[PDB]
């Protein structure tokens, strides 16, 4: 609860349950891309908060783009 607020994301998503579903899809796609093991052990963040933050900034993803069918 340092610098990612759940109130910041409840302006984009619904129900506080949709937030969990969408954030988990985003996080799973981040983690199934590498994101570690090579050079950034203590130089990055957790995919959970990285995915939860891109929703609170209208960043790399919005709810409609989060699919990647």
């Amino acid at each position: 609860m340092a610098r990612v607020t759940v109130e910041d994301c409840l302006d984009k998503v619904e129900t506080r349950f949709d937030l969990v579903v969408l954030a988990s899809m985003r996080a799973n796609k981040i983690l199934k891309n590498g994101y570690s093991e090579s050079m950034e052990n203590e130089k990055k963040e957790k995919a959970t908060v990285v995915a939860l933050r891109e929703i609170a900034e209208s960043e790399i993803t919005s709810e409609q783009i989060l699919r990647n069918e």
């Binding site: 609860m1 340092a2 607020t5 759940v6 109130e7 506080r16 937030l19 969990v20 954030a23 988990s24 996080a27 799973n28 983690l31 570690s36 093991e37 052990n41 203590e42 963040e45 957790k46 995919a47 959970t48 908060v49 939860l52």
Partner: protein
């Protein structure tokens, strides 16, 4: 066979099952009756065999239904197949709604008052077990061990490169903490762990009334969510920062409680003729700098200049300006108020009720994190200014009124006259009951009244100033603060304990005319043990009554879920005020808040105010009371 197992024992034995006993007791009658049938043995014994084969199977399926107690070696009835699926210790309960789990631990909880509301203190020794495969992977990742055996090895020697990997692994990885009876859903909350040293768990002081915990011995369990869908579910739904209000009411659960309430109550009181009275400050930095110098009191009335924005009910934002009349202590709290809230919230004495109101407004007008920041800051300020106050309790705080002895002597003379009546047979049940008990019940409260006119008032007469001022007594300020203590509890320390109860409920005619300060005698301390034992006996022979009711309620209503936005219905119930037949006892407002309308709410003249289908909120229930509507 692997479900009725034959595990060995210590020293050449077998702790066999009861399902093998009851299987053998059936095979050994089946075979017997078979080779008895082969020989054409008489019917008068073949029937006796057949009746024995049947009872053996009835016991294999469940003993106790018809037979008596078909019993094993240790004079204890054998456990059948219809006992491994039924009752509190069967399969359904104890194994399928149950499930002991891995990645789990326990410890004792301590207080740790320098935490933020979203944090807990987790020992290194526990956190190293709970997070052990994560550590194996992060070792074998960042080039410390090649195969998992050397990593497993350096984890048990507790190297130096391990205690920082553990700090990076548990960084933004939450954990849930639970207490002994989980009575509602606030008994589990997720936190963010920070490695401490020691063997207890540190628990933020404000999440304690949720858990119902204090720090005289309680313990707690720690579970680790393992998957990203459970790690996100921990942050988004359970994390302690989201659980600000009760789900049974709307009231807040992070309201400061005991000695945060006393500090905030202390500094915001005011003393009339104080040192530095009437000064003129222009900021919070001003009052701070002038206070830190020892030249001005904390209860001195001052004048302060404010200039701040204040949101109101409709949502508009006016501007609060001017020069207000304050106290030094209130103006020292002006630093923690956020923008949106008016200084009229702090500009009062700050009993428990008013602090909860501050937190209510902060949540309704400003939202979630504003409230969890304001609460932390109120926590720190109360903790600090109750200390700097040096507030204690002695034995002279319990001030015993000066009329007590005369009050009691007059009650005694009245009792003597009542029995004087009774000795001439002028009354039978009253002249030894319901009259003496009313004398004593009236004197009890006259003396409890005299005792608050002595612990509440004070006296100064300095500049011809001889008058009564509100006291700063430490026992009084603890009750009037709403921090801890009642009027009856205070009535027994320094008034008189009055009438006691034999367990059946009747009143013991002879009242304890002494309080805990002068000390009870032995014939007075005896008669107060009946009530004490009765209470303690009720307390434990009652949680079963309530736990049963709760379990029934959760089984009747369990599968009810909100599954759609509207059903289109137009029927409902007629709500009113729930009067007693004498007075209101609850308004229609506070009963219709949050409930949506099924019919229009046309007024007595003819025009309507609210259409059907409007979610009533606080900005629409004043129209119900301002326009005289009552159903």
């Amino acid at each position: 066979p692997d479900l009725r197992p034959l595990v060995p024992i210590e020293g050449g034995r077998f702790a066999t099952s009861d399902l093998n006993d009851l299987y053998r007791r059936v095979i050994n009658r089946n075979n017997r009756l078979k080779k008895l049938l082969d020989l054409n043995a008489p019917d008068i014994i073949v029937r006796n065999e057949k009746r024995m084969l049947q009872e053996a199977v009835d016991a294999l399926l469940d003993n106790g239904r018809r037979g008596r107690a078909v019993t094993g070696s240790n004079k204890r009835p054998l456990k059948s197949l219809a006992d491994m699926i039924k009752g509190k210790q069967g399969r359904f309960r104890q194994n399928l709604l149950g499930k002991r789990v891995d990645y789990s631990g326990r410890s004792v909880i301590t207080v740790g008052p320098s935490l933020r509301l979203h944090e807990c203190g987790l020992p290194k020794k526990m956190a190293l077990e709970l997070f052990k495969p994560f550590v194996y992977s992060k070792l074998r990742l960042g080039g410390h061990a090649t195969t998992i055996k050397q990593a497993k090895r350096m984890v048990e020697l507790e190297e130096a490169v391990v205690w920082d990997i553990l700090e990076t692994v548990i960084n933004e990885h939450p954990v849930l903490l639970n207490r002994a009876p989980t009575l509602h859903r606030l008994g589990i909350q997720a936190f963010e762990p920070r490695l401490i040293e020691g063997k207890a768990i540190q628990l933020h002081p404000l999440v304690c009334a949720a858990f119902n915990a204090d720090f005289d011995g309680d313990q707690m369990a720690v579970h680790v969510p393992l998957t990203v869908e459970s790690q996100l579910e921990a942050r988004v739904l359970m994390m302690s920062t989201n659980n600000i209000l009760s789900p049974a009411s709307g009231q807040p659960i992070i309201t400061p409680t005991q000695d945060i309430v006393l500090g905030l109550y202390y500094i915001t009181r005011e003393k009339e003729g104080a040192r530095g009275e009437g000064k003129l400050f222009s900021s919070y930095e001003d009052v701070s700098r002038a206070y830190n110098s020892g030249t001005i009191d904390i209860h001195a009335k001052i004048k302060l200049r404010i200039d701040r924005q204040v949101f109101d009910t409709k949502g508009n934002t006016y501007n609060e300006k001017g020069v207000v009349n304050t106290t030094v202590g209130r103006a020292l709290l002006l630093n923690i108020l956020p923008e949106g809230l008016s200084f009229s919230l702090l500009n009062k004495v700050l009993v428990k009720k008013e602090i909860s109101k501050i937190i209510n407004q902060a949540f309704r007008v400003l939202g979630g994190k504003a409230t969890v920041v304001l609460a932390d800051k109120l926590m720190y300020a109360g903790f600090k200014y109750s200390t700097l106050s040096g507030v204690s309790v002695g034995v002279d705080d319990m001030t015993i009124p000066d009329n007590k002895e005369a009050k009691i002597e007059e009650a005694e003379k009245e009792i003597k006259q009542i029995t004087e009546q009774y000795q001439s047979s002028l009354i039978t049940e009253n002249e030894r009951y319901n009259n003496i008990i009313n004398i004593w019940s009236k004197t009890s409260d006259e003396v409890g009244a005299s005792m608050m006119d002595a612990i509440s008032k004070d006296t100064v007469s300095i500049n011809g100033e001889k008058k009564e001022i509100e006291s700063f007594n430490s026992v009084y300020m603890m009750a009037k603060s709403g921090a801890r203590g009642s009027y009856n509890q205070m009535r027994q320390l320094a008034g008189m304990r009055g009438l006691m109860a034999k367990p059946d409920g009747t009143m013991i005619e002879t009242a304890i005319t002494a309080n805990f300060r002068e000390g009870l005698s032995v014939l007075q301390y005896f008669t107060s043990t009946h009530g004490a034992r009765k209470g303690l006996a009720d307390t434990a022979l009652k949680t079963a009554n309530a736990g049963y009711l709760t379990r029934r309620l959760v089984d009747v209503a369990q599968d009810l879920v909100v599954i759609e936005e509207d059903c289109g219905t137009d029927d409902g119930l007629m709500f009113s005020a729930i009067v007693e037949d004498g007075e209101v006892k609850v308004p229609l407002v506070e009963r219709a808040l949050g409930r949506t309308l099924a019919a229009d709410v046309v007024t007595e003249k003819g025009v309507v105010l609210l259409e059907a289908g409007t979610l009533l909120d606080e900005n629409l229930v004043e129209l119900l009371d301002d326009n005289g509507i009552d159903m």
